[PDB]
């Protein structure tokens, strides 16, 4: 009963602006299906969608906690909900997995090495994995990694509430609601990943649109990083940023992570493509950070204009954002395929981002029993 009285929610009560399609409103829902304040005029109310999800189908049966919260909630109440109501202890490591919302396929053991890297980095440190929630793209690879894991977990994903499929199926108050892992191919409403543990599904009022979870996730990660652990070795629950593939937005996410106080190290993987490959090609051909000569500059421009299908001015702006990222070249760790898996990267990020002395890093590695790192 504390979840309804502590968390709030918002629902679409607008003037129904048609724009393109007369049925589609500003929130995208049907014109008769109704029941920020700018053009949506949304009202606040106690939540009606929280509790347990029993994932029917999709291999193994797994129960995942969930709660629908407003996008403007303070992160302290969500973290108190995670520590108290969900009985989750304070973790020793935070992993932030970002990537492209479009579905993609990678190399087979690039996928396997990445999955085993995220899985064993999740068990050995007792980390928390932060994904996009829905079963698209990189989070689909994370869910396949968790399916292949099959052992022992806190892999809480944050998704828009309106983008989820069967929203009426997840309506209840502390009631176990069955969910279908089966998704329609044509339905634009995405599906929830079957092998996740918790959900921080956030409603800004709109349905079928993104952007309702990025600010809340970033504020919650900052608030967790302000939660200096009792060990307090130069940091508290240190934050890494795994990037697989990605689009134009993940470069801005990397810029927000690097240009932050305290700085967040960013790790990338190679071979997936798109933004990660241009980041790797920038990182190998960089010389002294921002000192990039003309030939690799217009090579980067033509690869941005070819892979991301952008115009010349958008490619120039993306190269400017790349150089602004590249000013902090020491924080970015690049994993290249070809006996080393992902495991030996997240750690590096913890070691350099912790920024303690080398006796402290040596004692932390001794605690983890990681001689190679």
């Amino acid at each position: 009963s504390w979840i309804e009285r502590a968390f709030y929610k918002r629902e679409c009560v607008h003037i129904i602006p048609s724009t393109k399609d007369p049925h589609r409103c500003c929130c995208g829902r049907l014109i008769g299906q109704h029941v920020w304040s700018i053009s949506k005029h949304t009202q606040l109310s106690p939540t009606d969608a929280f509790g347990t999800i029993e994932f029917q189908g999709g291999g193994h049966s797994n129960k995942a906690m969930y709660v629908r919260v407003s996008f403007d909630t303070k992160p302290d109440l969500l973290l108190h909900l995670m520590t108290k109501e969900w009985q989750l202890e304070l973790p020793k490591l935070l992993i932030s997995v970002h990537g492209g919302l479009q579905n993609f396929e990678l190399q087979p053991k690039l996928k396997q090495v990445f999955g085993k890297g995220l899985i064993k980095a999740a068990m050995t440190t007792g980390a928390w994995i932060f994904t996009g929630g829905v079963n698209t793209g990189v989070i689909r690879h994370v869910g396949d990694a968790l399916k292949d894991h099959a052992s022992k977990i806190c892999t809480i994903g944050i998704a828009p509430w309106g983008i989820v499929e069967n929203q009426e199926d997840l309506i209840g108050r502390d009631v176990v609601r069955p969910y279908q892992t089966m998704s329609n191919p044509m339905s634009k409403l995405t599906v929830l990943n079957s092998m996740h543990s918790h959900f921080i599904l956030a409603d800004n009022g709109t349905t079928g649109k993104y952007g309702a979870e990025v600010k809340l996730r970033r504020q919650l990660e900052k608030h967790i990083s302000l939660q200096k652990i009792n060990t307090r070795i130069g940091q508290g629950v240190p934050v890494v940023a795994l990037i697989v593939e990605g689009g134009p937005n993940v470069i801005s996410i990397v810029l927000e992570y690097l240009r932050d106080t305290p700085p967040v190290p960013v790790v990338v993987c190679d071979g997936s493509g798109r933004a990660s490959d241009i980041l790797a090609f920038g990182h190998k051909y960089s010389e002294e950070g921002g000192l990039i000569n003309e030939s690799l500059r217009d090579q980067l421009l033509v690869t941005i204009q070819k892979t991301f299908t952008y115009t010349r001015t958008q490619a120039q702006h993306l190269f400017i954002i790349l150089m602004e990222c590249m000013k902090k070249k020491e924080l970015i760790t690049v994993f290249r395929m070809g006996h080393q898996d992902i495991d030996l990267a997240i750690l590096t990020a913890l070691l350099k981002g912790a920024n303690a002395s080398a006796p402290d890093q040596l004692s932390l590695a001794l605690a983890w029993n990681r001689v190679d790192i």
Partner: protein
């Protein structure tokens, strides 16, 4: 059966999966039973 019948977007009638579960049990089809339990039906709610 795994790659096309149990593909994404396939609508399923209520109670038909338990009938197929019984039919897989009586014909000694171990892999169909493994697939079926994998696709949502539990032994607690089926076996009477």
């Amino acid at each position: 059966a795994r790659s096309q019948i149990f593909i994404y977007g396939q609508q399923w009638p209520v109670g038909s999966l338990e009938q197929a579960m019984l039919d897989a049990l009586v014909l000694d089809r171990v892999d169909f039973v493994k697939l079926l339990i994998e696709n949502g039906v539990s032994m607690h709610r089926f076996l009477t």
